[PDB]
Amino acid sequence: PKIYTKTGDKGFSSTFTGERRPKDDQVFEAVGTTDELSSAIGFALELVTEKGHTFAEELQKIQCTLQDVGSALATPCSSAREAHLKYTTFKAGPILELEQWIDKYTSQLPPLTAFILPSGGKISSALHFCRAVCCRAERRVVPLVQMGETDANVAKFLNRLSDYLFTLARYAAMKEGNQEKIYMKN
Amino acid sequence: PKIYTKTGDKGFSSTFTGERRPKDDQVFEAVGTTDELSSAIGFALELVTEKGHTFAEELQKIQCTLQDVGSALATPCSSATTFKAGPILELEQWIDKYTSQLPPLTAFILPSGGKISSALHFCRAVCCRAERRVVPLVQMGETDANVAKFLNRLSDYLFTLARYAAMKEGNQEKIYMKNDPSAESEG
Amino acid sequence: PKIYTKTGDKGFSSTFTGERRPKDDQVFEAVGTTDELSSAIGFALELVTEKGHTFAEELQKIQCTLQDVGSALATPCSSAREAHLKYTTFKAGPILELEQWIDKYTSQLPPLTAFILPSGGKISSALHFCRAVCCRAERRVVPLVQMGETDANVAKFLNRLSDYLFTLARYAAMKEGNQEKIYMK
Ligand SMILES: Nc1ncnc2c1ncn2[C@@H]1O[C@H](COP(=O)(O)OP(=O)(O)OP(=O)(O)O)[C@@H](O)[C@H]1O
Ligand SMILES: Nc1ncnc2c1ncn2[C@@H]1O[C@H](COP(=O)(O)OP(=O)(O)OP(=O)(O)O)[C@@H](O)[C@H]1O
Ligand SMILES: Nc1ncnc2c1ncn2[C@@H]1O[C@H](COP(=O)(O)OP(=O)(O)OP(=O)(O)O)[C@@H](O)[C@H]1O
Ligand SMILES: [K+]
Ligand SMILES: [K+]
Ligand SMILES: [K+]
Ligand SMILES: [K+]
Ligand SMILES: [K+]
Ligand SMILES: [K+]
Ligand SMILES: [Mg+2]
Ligand SMILES: [Mg+2]
Ligand SMILES: [Mg+2]
Ligand SMILES: [Mg+2]
């Protein structure tokens, strides 16, 4: 069977529960923005792997969890059978692991005091962009959690992930020798 | 007449029909996201040309069609458009060509496979976002249905091209593996 | 302190004026998309500095002004008090400077066309992506201007910045001796 089924050609698509919705539904905005984040991370990962940083494995693990995020988002509670809710439950384990990684890098960084510019070299800049896309994904998940469609832990993970990406960007810039850019109005 | 006319400085702009709409109108959201997609493809194209891949001209032709998509979107029928299906069938022929050079997809791949493949997966995700912005305009009857079908087919092409580029470069794509640091998974 | 306060874990966040609003509120969509634009420019900047182009300094100054844009957006006029005027005020100066920079490059470039594809080399193509994200940021700020939440000059600056990014992309392509790709039917 060809990759193009054409069943999505008139603007509808399927969730994991089998429910079909218009493609501009909040579910597909959330699934799609999570995929956009994972794709941005995938490009940043290519810059890590080539430039000799060592945290590539952490970003790959995050992409795996982002697939679990996408699967949970694609399983709205309002149309989920018993057997589907195995995919709606998003366990909190990965959130705790992000906190442990944030702690690990924070020990090696200078104190964060003021706002910094998104900068610090190619990899740090890419990770700041990933961070911004992650914040956008969070904004897309918030209404689904408010409507009872999605486990609150999905949004908690994305909230914590933007802190991880911020911290990893600062870590990468420090390892490259690039000092943080601080600007204050006036 | 400089490039900055300032006619957009109060938050309104003009469609191709000359109609004034606020810049957050669904028309400009669709036009803008199609332009974002074309721009992402343009950056991927730069990486493709550096590596010497064969499909640089296909991506350039796609950018041309995306300008036609933007033109159609900027011409709502309510204030008027004809997007032919030709480009959709050409995408299908290209997908078929690359699919014939690849194994069937068995594993769930992550966005990965090299700098070029990963850039194409990002273009794929932006293309899906463009599709979501065009769907309400088609459903309202403002835009030719073929515009949404082209964007639907294009994310399939970008996915297939990413896989094809990784194969030609000899790069290992990453596959999904369950991440369960707290041993909470049941099955 | 841990950077993760978890006060955002239930879908709400803070404005600079002390409001709590849901994270999908238009204020955070605008703040977030301006941050996305600044981060995209930061990546473009790294490509520019690898070639030692002096206009890296213009891109870094723009990142600073985008921080001021974000601060203004995060300080909605509906809840601002007297001391918040330091952040709600957005003067016309940065807009006029973009126009001067646009004029500077335009006098060195071939006549303007509306039929170039996003192209012209890695730097030029990256700047065309930044331009598209800039237009998206502008779309997120215009409803806040309409609601009286944000200074009109904030949207004017983002409008002008798209034109600057377009012009700088053309200028980078020319300096590299790169032919831009042209639309064909
Ligand atoms: N534009 C989109 N944005 C976000 N999510 C999407 C979009 N299109 C589809 N999806 C989701 O991603 C899944 C796979 O996408 P796919 O393109 O195979 O589906 P489709 O567009 O419905 O069908 P087809 O492309 O074969 O016509 C869908 O089942 C749906 O859950
Ligand atoms: N922020 C935006 N997002 C998406 N599309 C836009 C945006 N602004 C304008 N457009 C569309 O793109 C076309 C060209 O944009 P341009 O920036 O020249 O228009 P403007 O902002 O209305 O005018 P000016 O920038 O000269 O004040 C416009 O005619 C309109 O159709
Ligand atoms: N997802 C988002 N999109 C856009 N802007 C955001 C988002 N989350 C927070 N903000 C804004 O950015 C500021 C800093 O974000 P931060 O992540 O520290 O806040 P939070 O998410 O509310 O708290 P925490 O992350 O500690 O639980 C916030 O005060 C808010 O103004
Ligand atoms: K498909
Ligand atoms: K968006
Ligand atoms: K203009
Ligand atoms: K969009
Ligand atoms: K935080
Ligand atoms: K690069
Ligand atoms: Mg947060
Ligand atoms: Mg223009
Ligand atoms: Mg599809
Ligand atoms: Mg404009």
How many CB atoms are closer than 10 A to CB B130?
Answer: 30
* Chain B nearest C-alpha distance from A157 (Å): 13
Q: How many CA atoms lie within 13 A of B30 on its CB side?
A: 27
Q: Judge: B125–A32 Cβ closer than 8 Å, yes or no.
A: yes
Cβ neighbours of residue B165 under 8 Å, at least 6 residues apart? B48, B53, B55, B113, B114, B116, B117, B120
Distance CA A163, CA A112 (A): 12
**Helices within chain B (DSSP H only):** 26-51, 56-73, 86-99, 115-139, 145-169
Q: Which chains touch A (3 or more CB pairs under 8 A)?
A: B, C
* Chain B nearest C-alpha distance from C42 (Å): 15
Question: Burial level of B41, CB count in 10 A (0-12/13-18/19+)?
Answer: buried
**Does residue B31 have its Cβ closer than 6 Å to ligand 2?**
yes
| CA of B7, closest atom in ligand 2 | 27
How many CB atoms are closer than 10 A to CB A179?
Answer: 11
Best of A112, A159, A161 to mutate for ligand 3, by most ligand atoms within 8 A of CB? A159
Q: Of all helices (H) and strands (E), which one includes residue B14?
A: strand B12-14
Cβ neighbours of residue A38 under 8 Å, at least 6 residues apart? A63, A66, A67, A70, B110, B111, B125
Q: Judge: C35–A115 Cβ closer than 8 Å, yes or no.
A: no
Nearest of C157, C149, C121, C99 to residue C48 by alpha carbon: C121
| CA of A32, closest atom in ligand 1 | 4
Q: Which amino acid is at C144?
A: L
| CA of C12, closest atom in ligand 3 | 22
DSSP 8-state code for residue B114: S
Cβ neighbours of residue A126 under 8 Å, at least 6 residues apart? A40, A43, A44, A47, C43
Distance CA C145, CA C151 (A): 6
Distance CA A99, CA B120 (A): 31
Question: Burial level of B162, CB count in 10 A (0-12/13-18/19+)?
Answer: buried
**Residue B1 domain flag:** no
What distance in angstroms lies between residue B154's CA and the mean position of ligand 4's atoms?
9
**Residue C16 domain flag:** yes
What distance in angstroms lies between residue B5's CA and the mean position of ligand 6's atoms?
6
Distance CA B77, CA C106 (A): 36
Tell me the two tokens of residue B162: 């990413």
How many CB atoms are closer than 10 A to CB A117?
Answer: 21
Tell me the two tokens of residue A180: 């943080």
Q: Assign residue B11 a region (left: φ > 0; alpha: ψ between -120 and 50; beta: otherwise).
A: left
Work out how many domains chain A is built from and give that number.
1
Residue B108's alpha-carbon distances to A2, A67, B35, C47, in angstroms, are: 17, 10, 29, 33
Tell me the two tokens of residue C56: 């890296």
Tell me the two tokens of residue A9: 């050609």
**Residue B66 domain flag:** yes
Nearest of B66, B71, B81 to residue B141 by alpha carbon: B81
**Residue B2 domain flag:** no
**Residue C177 domain flag:** yes
Nearest of B175, B163, B148 to residue B30 by alpha carbon: B148
Q: Which chains touch C (3 or more CB pairs under 8 A)?
A: A, B
For CA atoms A40, B171, A119, C155, give the dihedral sign: negative
Residue C165: strand pairing partners: none
Whether C3 and chain A come into contact, CB under 8 Å, resolves to: yes
Residue A183's alpha-carbon distances to A114, A123, A180, C39, C61, in angstroms, are: 8, 21, 10, 15, 10
Return the residue whose CA atom lies nearest to atom 15 of ligand 1: A13
* Strand duo B20-22 + B12-14: pairing: antiparallel
Which member of C115, C133, C159 has the closest CB to residue B8? Answer: C159
Cβ distance A40 to A133 under 8 Å? yes
**Residue B35 domain flag:** yes
Q: Cα–Cα–Cα angle for C38, C44, C50, nearest 5°?
A: 135
Angle formed by the axes of helices C152-175 and C122-146, to 10°? 170
Q: How many CA atoms lie within 13 A of C79 on its CB side?
A: 14
B12-15, Cβ contacts within 8 angstroms, sequence gap of 24 or more = B15/B74, B15/B75, B15/B76, B15/B79
**Does residue B152 have its Cβ closer than 6 Å to ligand 1?**
yes
Which residue is associated with the tokens 């008090």? C81
Tell me the two tokens of residue B4: 């900055």
Interface test with B, best of A37, A43, A95, A101 (most B CBs within 10 A): A43
Nearest of B88, B64, B78, B63 to residue B143 by alpha carbon: B78
**What residues of A are in contact with residue B135 (Cβ under 8 Å)?**
11, 22-24
Distance CA B18, CA C21 (A): 37
- A10 three-state secondary structure: coil
Whether A156 and chain C come into contact, CB under 8 Å, resolves to: yes
**Residue B6 domain flag:** no
DSSP 8-state code for residue C121: S
Query: DSSP for C45-97?
Result: HHHHHTTT-TTHHHHHHHHHHHHHHHHHHTS-TTT--GGGHHHH---SHHHHH
Distance CA A43, CA C121 (A): 19
Give the range of the structural domain holding residue C17, as residue numbers without chain letter: 12-185
DSSP 8-state code for residue C4: -
**Residue C48 domain flag:** yes
The approach used to solve this structure was: X-ray
